[PDB]
Amino acid sequence: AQPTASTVEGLFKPSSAFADRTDFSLSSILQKSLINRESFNQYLAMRLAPVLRTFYEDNYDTDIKERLNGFTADTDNAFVSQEQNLRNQFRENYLVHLQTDIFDNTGGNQAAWKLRDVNNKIIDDFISRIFAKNFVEYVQDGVGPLTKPTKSLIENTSNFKNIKLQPKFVNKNAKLKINNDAVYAAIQDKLLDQFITNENPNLVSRVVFTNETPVDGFDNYFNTKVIQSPTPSYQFQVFNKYNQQSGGTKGANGFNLLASNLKSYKNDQSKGIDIPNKFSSDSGGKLLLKASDMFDTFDPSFSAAFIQGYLALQKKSKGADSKEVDSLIKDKSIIENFFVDNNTTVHKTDLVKIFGDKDVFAGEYKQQISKAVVDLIEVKKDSSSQPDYILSRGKDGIHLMAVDGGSHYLTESGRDVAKQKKFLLFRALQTKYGLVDTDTTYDFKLFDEVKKYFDTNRILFLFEALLDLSSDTNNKDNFLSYPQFKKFADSIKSIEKDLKELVQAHYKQAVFNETAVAENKVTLKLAERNQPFIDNERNNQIEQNGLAAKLPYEQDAKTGHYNDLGNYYKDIIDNVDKKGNFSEEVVSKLKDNKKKVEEAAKKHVEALKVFTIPSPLYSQVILVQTKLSFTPESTSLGLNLALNNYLTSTELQNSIKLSYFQEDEAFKKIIDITNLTFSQQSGGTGGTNGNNNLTADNWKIFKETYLLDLFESQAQKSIFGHVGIEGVLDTLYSSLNLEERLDSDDVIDYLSYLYTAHWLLKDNLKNYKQSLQSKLSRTSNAFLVWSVDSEKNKDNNSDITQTEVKNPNFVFGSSVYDRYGFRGIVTSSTSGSLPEAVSRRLFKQFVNQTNNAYKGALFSFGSMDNLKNIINGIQTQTEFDALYNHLTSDLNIDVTGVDKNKTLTEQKTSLTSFVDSNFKQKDVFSRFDGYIGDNKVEEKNYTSYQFLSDGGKYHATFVKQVNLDDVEKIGTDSLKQEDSSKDKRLNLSLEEFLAAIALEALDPNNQTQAINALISGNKKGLVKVGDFRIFSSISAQWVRRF
């Protein structure tokens, strides 16, 4: 089957270089690919599974020996099937697509496919068999591990040292068929420790008393006249009071059976805390609150309360009240514990002051709630002791939680990961032999949890575990010293000097990435939980809150981060740092490790001596190769796979777009693209001369406008802190880690906006003039509007349009507890951002029926003869219809003698005659620069301005008039700092003009035009690409084939 010539001519032609820039060379593209997490893991698979091939090779078991032969046979059969189906599908040109859509993604060779699928099969099998057995044991000396250790033997802190995750019949000095378990128990105890290290997986024994529908009746608690038809939930939380007659063990009865003897559920020998299942409404028991999905799989009020207990052990918990076990309110309902004293810290929801002079509660709630209200309190055995039990109410009722072993492996110095691993191994041993108490059930499988967390990094984590295994030369009891695994442990030894410098950094940064991702969920989900209690206050439904209480956790005004809740993850990044506020520490140690990955990847690619192999027949990729590696073929294919992932990735596309910015010398004079810092600092480097004459602060306002446009699109706007907005904006900017991520969408969009802002600023605003001309019109007034919403209407003459509206629409939380308004040049056709009230007052009700009220109405024409030159310019009937309606229904100018029945000539003739005979010079053509509301006044006379009124709300609006008589007048002298040149920029100041230009730059049409200018205005032309994976990845608007 000779392939047809059409596809052969039409297929991509591989070249010597991937692209034609100084950052797209082999030594740079391979380094960047090895820094890409997904690409790096695709490489590590091919550099890690050759290590695990040796274990299958020297293994005693006949089955494991035959696994390699079976994998090769299955690979041959799969190749036969692939060839058969490709032939039956493509016929004439099947070989071309066999090399194109299969081999290129695989390594570019027939044997490349077999070295991919076999090398993945063996690593998958080795991954499965690590966790195929349970090895948590209490090891006795001279008889081996006891088949069933006794309860009193293992439930001791001093006896934790004997729970070491060791196999049963493994002898170092013997060739045992099942000696391979000595491998897994060594790797598992490594992987498990990673699980103990990164996830910080504390166990919590918790009891939840679900929300109770009150048989007493909600009217007793929450009156219907204010709260109609309550439903059992957090906001209306009620439990039937404790009665001794009914023989119940849940609700207040369960809380009485529980809190009376609360001190007796901590097994002080084991330091663990075990609370009975029957005392909880659900199945009850213990849950694993690891760092990753504890704010995902469970309620935020639950996970955050567990964190509060976590730091309560470590004397780091803040904001919560403390009361002893004996002080618990068990006779009354449970909620009475939370009505804490108000007289004079602890963050208490004083609902008496919150609801003001409105009756929201009734009966016992009204009498109690005076007395503040909280959500979480700390209950402890003794006044001198530290809080071991935490009581908090969430979505599904009130939970009493206690971390078990917290006094053991969590102290003021931080988390003790060795003790934590020992304690969780003790719990896993408890579950292994059914040695738990009869009144509790262990829904706790540590091996399943470590397997599920480790399976995310199925390649990096296993490789790092092996490296740390071979990094411990002082421990002679590992499987490395077993003569059965002498060469296998040598294979792990042949990968330290080569890759470990890179893999340690990659692991230490990926774990930090996951830790930052998980700790972002803290401030994300706490805000999500607090969202309805802000919605209620927004909708004037504050009374719906009822029993809603603010959590004790403090937030950062300057950062928008929960510091104490971040300590739970700081106790992770302080552990992965030693391997080999949390916000500041992680932001420092992510860049200090990203530079380490840069260095390690560059050294690894250097030491590999990478050269480009010529591509095979019908190939469309630029493959690479190496020879300075322990297994040259697998390392070459690993680099091939890492490249196949990076070239198709959006990181390389954003790198190409980054290079297009690199080329533009005009833009690079004002920015430092790699540094993402505005250039020229502050001085005379190019200052002052034409061609975008402005400072570097003059670009900070463009950046701030971009940040505000991004902030307005945020799903939640309180995850970034609060007061004003100049701080929240830089916090949002930091949150993007743009300088740490130069090959992201978040940076190409930022730079696209920045060159949109410059492409309106260059050539003496040659494109800003065009945008304004195509936006403005002569028959419609245009304004620069500073419109603020005043919920209250009016020397006590402070301007309210220049006073910052902190927390507008309650966007930075709630106020009661814990020159602005600019819209740019807004016209009638584009008045979406303006409120309908002010937009109608400007572009449809300029001169209301209630003098200077006509000033600026026909300023859209600017001069006397201008509207005369436009009225006779009408050719058709509808053209005059629009003008007449605008002059009457919009510009409210009285018309005399006009007739609809007139012909085309007389139609315009009557209007021209009446315009001339009515305006034979009321400052109608003057420029209106002042306040518009219920009345109209100038800027100077703010003492006589009536705010616009609409639907009970008020608006304060400043408008500066803009016509085409100043759109054309912006030119070379438009960016000068001088005040006398303000007429050269729409009679604006420089800052106002640049803010308007930035708002114009946010236009998608402006950005598209400026980006096409960037690509077309390239000194070297469009970037060429020699690899198809770089051509298909990014659109032809940026890259061209050779």
Is residue 835 within 8 A of residue 955, CB to CB? The reply is yes
Backbone angles phi, psi at 172, to 5 degrees: -60, -45
Angle at 492 between CA 490 and CA 493, to 5 degrees: 60
Distance CA 749, CA 657 (A): 10
Per the DSSP assignment, residues forming a β-bridge with 323 are 379
Question: Phi and psi at residue 739, in whole multiples of 5°?
Answer: -65, -30
Whether the CB-CB separation of 403 and 308 falls below 8 Å is answered with no
H-assigned helices in 410-500: 417-432, 446-454, 460-471, 486-493
8 Å CB contact between 911 and 920: no
- How far is residue 34's CA from residue 44's CA, in Å, rounded to a whole number? 9
Q: Look at residue 145 and give its three-state secondary structure.
A: strand
Q: Residue 912 and residue 867: Cα distance in Å, rounded?
A: 9
Name the residue with tokens 């077309």.
Answer: 1016
DSSP helix/strand/coil, 12: coil
Rounded to whole angstroms, the Cα distance separating 355 from 541 reads 11
- Axis crossing angle, helix 766-775 with helix 990-1001, rounded to the nearest 10: 70
Give dist(CA 263, CA 439) in Å, integer. Answer: 17
- Cα–Cα distance between 68 and 55 in angstroms, integer? 11
CA angle, 299 as apex, 293 and 305 as ends, to 5°? Answer: 95
* Residues 6 or more apart whose Cβ sits within 8 Å of residue 297: none
Nearest CA to 146 among 158, 136, 134, 138?
Answer: 138
**95: number of CA atoms within 13 Å, CB side?**
10
Cβ burial of 62 (10 Å; 0-12, 13-18, 19+) is exposed
Q: How far apart are CA 930 and CA 924, in angstroms?
A: 15
Contact call for residues 564 and 318 (beta carbons, < 8 A): yes
Look up tokens 């920015």; give the residue: 671
- 930 is written with which tokens? 């002042």
- For 681, counting Cβ atoms within 10 Å of its Cβ (0-12 exposed, 13-18 middle, 19+ buried), the class is exposed
Separation CA 927–CA 987 (nearest Å): 10
Distance of CA 993 to the CA centre of its chain: 33
CA distance 955 to 788: 6
Give me the DSSP letters along 730-773.
HHHHHHTTTTT-TTSHHHHHHHHHHHHHHHTTSTTTHHHHHHHH
Q: At how many Å resolution was this determined?
A: 5.4
> Other CB atoms closer than 10 Å to residue 713's CB: what's the count?
8
Strand partners, 410: 415
* Residues in Cβ contact with 1034 at an 8 Å cutoff, skipping those fewer than 6 apart: 652, 653, 656, 657
For every residue of 338-367, which 3-state class applies, written as one string?
Answer: CCCCCCCCECCECHHHHCCCCCCECHHHHH
- Give which of 336, 320, 321, 376 is closest to 252, Cα–Cα: 336
Exposed e or buried b for every residue in 373-382, given b needs 16+ CB within 10 A? bbbbbbbbbe
What token pair was written down for 1007?
């950005």
Technique used by the depositors: cryo-EM
Phi, psi of 956 (to 5 degrees): -110, 120
Closest CA to 891 of 927, 854, 839, 865: 854
Q: How far apart are CA 258 and CA 205, in angstroms?
A: 13
Phi/psi at 402 (nearest 5 deg)?
Answer: -150, 125
- How far is the C-alpha of 884 from the C-alpha of 115, rounded, in Å? 78
Cis omega (within 30 of 0) for bond into 731: no
Tally of CA atoms within 13 A in the half-sphere of 763 that contains its CB: 10
Which residue from 911, 786, 924, 954 is spatially nearest to 852, judged by alpha carbons?
Answer: 924
What does DSSP assign to residue 100? I
Distances 741 to 20, 36, 588 between C-alpha atoms, Å: 22, 11, 14
8 Å CB contact between 790 and 841? no
3-state secondary structure of 925: coil
Task: List the beta strands (DSSP E) in 118-180.
Answer: 139-140, 144-145
Strand (E) or helix (H) holding 573: helix 563-576
DSSP 942-997: GGG-PPEEETTEEEEEEEEEE-HHHHTT-SGGGS-S-GGGGGGTTT--HHHHHHHH
b/e per residue 307-343 (b: at least 16 CB within 10 A): bbbbbbbbebbebbbebbbeebbbebbbbbbbbbeee
Helix (H, G, I), strand (E, B) or coil at 1024: strand
**Closest alpha carbon to 121 in 74, 79, 83:** 74
Identify any residues that bridge with 272 across adjacent strands, giving them in sequence order: 267
Q: Which among 267, 521, 539, 272 has a CA at the least distance from the CA of 408?
A: 272
Backbone angles phi, psi at 891, to 5 degrees: -90, 0
